[PDB]
């Protein structure tokens, strides 16, 4: 959300498009724009966090399962706490003794 929140996509893109229009960008392509394409890139900019567990790789060895996608309990909180989200994701596939 820090990159493509709906408030950003509306207000900032409308302001940038209005500035480009007033400069004359749509009259002739000479003008240089300033982020008028933000709604086109929704969910693509810094949208993921990938962490490879080096200790787990060392424990497992040459043959191992690669990766797993993990969804948090709160679906819109990883951007608020990246480290907490990654540790919660790594809570899943660990060595288990019972």
């Amino acid at each position: 959300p820090a990159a493509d929140a709906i408030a950003k996509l509306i207000i900032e893109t409308t302001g940038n498009l209005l500035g480009y229009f007033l400069l004359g960008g749509f009259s002739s392509a000479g003008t240089i724009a300033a982020d008028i394409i933000m709604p086109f890139l929704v969910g693509t900019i810094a949208a993921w966090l990938q962490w490879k567990n080096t200790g787990r790789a060392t424990e497992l060895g040459w043959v191992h399962y690669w990766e797993l996608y993990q969804q948090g309990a709160e679906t819109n909180s990883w951007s608020l706490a990246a480290l907490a989200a990654l540790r919660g994701g790594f809570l899943v596939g660990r060595s288990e003794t019972v």
Partner: peptide, 13 residues
């Protein structure tokens, strides 16, 4: 490249 492509589209709007 993606930025240029979408800037071209928005200009052609």
């Amino acid at each position: 490249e993606v930025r240029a492509y979408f800037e071209n589209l928005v200009q052609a709007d």
